[PDB]
Every structure is written in structure tokens, then in C-alpha cells.
């Protein structure tokens, strides 16, 4: 059955209106893009679209879009049997459920986000990184496509694994999680898809994507996974602009 979870929400109230945040956004970055109607056709995002994409006010109140605020650096403790639901069509990952969860706990990564990286990264040809690739005798594994260049995934992914001593699937799963934390969660101000994307606390500093819908799409995906498991997230950090009445106090 559906399992409700006691939410732990932090409300980051920003000392700027959404309007002023958009104004800072257009003046601090370049090449903000958005998809066309028929996808795989990027174009320039207008200011109105940028501002809409920045609207934490609409996202907070949305069932799926609130996941733009899920805290990706926090291990939740989701029942491992529920997690196996995400790994139905992925035997090799399914079997490592326990390893993914221990790595999520030890390296500080939300388990759904961690597995979604493994799921969406061992697909098609890349699955061979998860099964192991041989090299000069030993063998090496890569569960998140770390360092796997799109031109030559296996050689690069495997050589990266080799370079990092990932000679066991457990070492790759653990090491790979430490990589995800170090790379995507290295800043305390960018532990959510929303803050990763707009860096509202450090105007002008690194944003993780130029596609204005990057957080939206990735939140839909995480939300769907939780829904597929019949449960929900626990830790969230909402970003709220100073002109958002409906949430500035709450
Ligand atoms: Cl954050
Ligand atoms: Na600009």
C-alpha cells in the first residue's frame, strides 16, 4: 500500500522578489535554452520563460514539481522492497539494492536520486560498464557512467573505473556515490534540483544546466519514481521569494 512519510521541510526565504531574481538571472548568465514543441530542438528562452521557470511559487504547490525541492544530499531510509520497484527491468542493479542504499547512507545522497543516476546511466551499451570490462588482466566496474564520454563510453568509462581502482561492483557503487556527492552536491547551497539550476543563494555562480526546464524535467522523473514506489519524499528545502505571500510565512 501507499506509504506516507513525515516531511522535514526547510523554508529558505530569499531577500529578493521573483522579479528581481529574474533580473539578476538574465544579467548573470547567458545561453538559457528551452525545447521546441517537438523536442531535440533547442532554442533561446525568453525572459518571461526564464522567470516562469524560476517560479518557486508555482512549483511548491504542485505535486510533482515540489520535487524540484527534494534534498538530494539526504539519505531517506526508504524500504528496500519499495526500491526494488525502480529496478524491476534491471537485474544487475536490482541485485545491488543493498549496496546502493548503504552507499546512499554513507556518502550522503538521496537513494532515489542515486539510483536514477545508475538507471539512466547503465542503459543500452553502457550496461557493460556495470557488468565489468576487462583491462590488462584485472576487471573494472562503473555504475554511473563516470567519465564515460559519449564518443567512446566503454573505453573511457572503464578506464576511468581502472584509474579509480573500481575492481569490484561494490567499490564502483560506493566510489561512484562519493563522486556524485563531490560533483553535484559539493555546495550546501545547491542540494536541490532548484538550487542546482538557479543557484539562488550565490547569484552568478555555477548553475548545473542551461535548459530552463532541467529541474522541472528531473523533478517529474524523481516524483514519478516515488509514485511508482507508492511513497513520497521526506526532506525538502523550499526557496521562497520575498514577494510570495502564499509561502513567505508558512
Ligand atoms: Cl539547497
Ligand atoms: Na545574460
Author numbering: 1 to 250
Paper text:
Here, we present two crystal structures of GH73 enzymes from S. aureus, including glucosaminidase B (SagB) and the glucosaminidase part of major bifunctional autolysin (AtlA-gl). SagB crystallized with two and AtlA-gl with one molecule per asymmetric unit. In contrast to the crystal structure of AtlE and related N-acetylglucosaminidases, which were all observed in the closed form, these two proteins crystallized in the open form. Hence, for AtlA-gl and SagB to cleave a single glycan strand, both of their domains have to slide together into a closed conformation as observed in the AtlE structure.
SagB crystallized in the P6122 space group with two molecules per asymmetric unit. The structure of SagB is well-resolved based on electron density maps along the entire chain with the exception of the N36 to A41 region in both molecules, as indicated by the Ramachandran outliers and higher atomic B-values, as well as a few other side chains. The crystal structure also contains eight PEG molecules (PG4), two chloride ions and one sodium ion. The two molecules superimpose with a root-mean-square-deviation (RMSD) of 0.46 Å over all Cα atoms. The catalytic residue E121 is positioned at the C-terminus of helix α10. The R-domain comprises residues from A1 to D71 and S187 to K250, whereas the L-domain comprises residues from L72 to S186. The failure of molecular replacement was the first indication that the SagB structure must differ from the AtlE structure in spite of their high sequence similarity. Moreover, the angle of rotation of the SagB structure superimposed on the AtlE R-domain with the SagB structure superimposed onto the AtlE L-domain is 31° with a 3.5 Å screw translational component. Thus, the packing of the R-domains and L-domains in the SagB structure differs from their packing in the AtlE structure. The equivalent helix in the AtlE structure is distorted after the fourth turn with the aromatic residue Y201 slightly exposed. The α15 helix in SagB is almost a whole turn shorter and shares the same minor widening in the last turn of the helix at position F185.
